[PDB]
Write a protein that binds this ligand. Structure first.
Ligand code: NI
Length: 341
């Protein structure tokens, strides 16, 4: 049965609610983004209307085989009527195709559902600027002050400089980057661009990347592993055993691997600056964990919410424990008292 924080009151609508069977009263199912915890339940046998971005719709059709007649793509930044209710999709600064949804309820209430997002000051000049929001359904993944990490631009700077230095010292080194979902494509694209290489990958991953509307993608990626000196591998293979096994397969072309694991936050963030990060090394293999986040830091979250001044907040992450729920409610009240709303 579908939980309350996935229902939009006063509508026939749900958000990211595909794993509960037929939801009673649901006339339209919104999907914020193509991440498995959110699409869990969709398949080619689904027969209700799905509303989403163009990119998410490309992924539903090609990767999950949802039939075309049930896919309803909407443009961003555009007032649209769905089943008699005005909605707007906004870029969530998460993975490709991810959106926030603004719902203008028939009784005058305005609701923002952030989906998964990385708050940014640029959102203060979207269509959010123009009116009041009564209820906020909020991605609270990192809602605690210990969660600090650098900008995405600082992280990419570190990765490009690390890769370029290593491969210029040793032209026979291979760079490997882990992946297990869409998102974080800048990591491998930026490294390949500095090295003058295409990115090599499996047929299944190439297919996924071809759904993303990335400009000039055919110039950037390939299934021909032999031609490429940046390879993508599943995240589970980014360890000494997996990388040894991969280097064997390269036919003595390479004699060293430098690998990256983009993670979210890890506790080494509470001590170490990005500049000071060091790898784990065994022989001719080195592995860097880099804190490339597609979710808000605590400070970015707090800034956004203090700017929006919502009347009520409904968390959508960390909702399973009383300790989590109580911690999150305490910060919401601090934020409201400090800013005066
Ligand atoms: Ni996500």
């Amino acid at each position: 049965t579908c939980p309350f924080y996935k229902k939009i009151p006063g509508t026939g609508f749900t958000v990211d609610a595909f794993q509960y069977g037929v939801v009673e009263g649901c006339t339209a199912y919104f999907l914020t983004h193509f991440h498995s915890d959110h699409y869990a339940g969709l398949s080619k046998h689904f027969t209700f209307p799905v509303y989403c971005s163009e990119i998410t719709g490309n992924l539903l059709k090609n990767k999950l085989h949802v039939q075309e007649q049930y896919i309803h793509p909407l443009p961003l930044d555009t007032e649209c009527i769905v089943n008699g209710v005005k909605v707007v999709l906004l870029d969530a600064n998460h993975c490709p195709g991810a959106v926030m949804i603004l719902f203008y309820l028939p009784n005058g209430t305005v609701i923002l559902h952030t989906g998964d997002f990385r708050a940014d000051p640029s959102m203060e000049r979207s269509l959010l600027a123009d009116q009041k929001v009564h209820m906020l359904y909020l991605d609270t993944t990192y809602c605690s002050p210990e969660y600090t990490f650098p900008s995405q631009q600082e992280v990419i700077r570190f990765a490009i400089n690390t890769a370029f230095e290593a491969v210029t010292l040793n032209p026979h080194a291979l760079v490997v980057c882990g992946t297990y979902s869409i998102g974080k494509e800048k990591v491998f694209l930026a490294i390949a661009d500095v090295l003058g290489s295409k990115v090599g990958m499996s047929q299944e991953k190439y297919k996924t990347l071809q759904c993303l509307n990335i400009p000039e993608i055919n110039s950037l990626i390939t299934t021909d592993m032999c031609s490429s000196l940046v390879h993508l591998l599943p995240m589970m293979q980014i360890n000494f055993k997996g990388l040894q096994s991969h280097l064997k397969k390269c036919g003595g072309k390479y004699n060293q691997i430098l690998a990256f694991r983009p993670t979210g936050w890890t506790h080494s963030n509470k001590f170490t600056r990005i500049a000071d990060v060091i790898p784990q090394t065994k022989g001719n293999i080195s592995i860097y964990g880099i804190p490339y986040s597609e979710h808000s830091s605590y400070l970015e979250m707090k800034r956004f919410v203090q700017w929006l001044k919502p009347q009520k907040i409904i968390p959508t992450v960390n909702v399973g424990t009383w300790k989590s729920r109580s911690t999150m409610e305490k910060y919401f009240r601090e934020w409201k008292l400090e800013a005066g709303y």
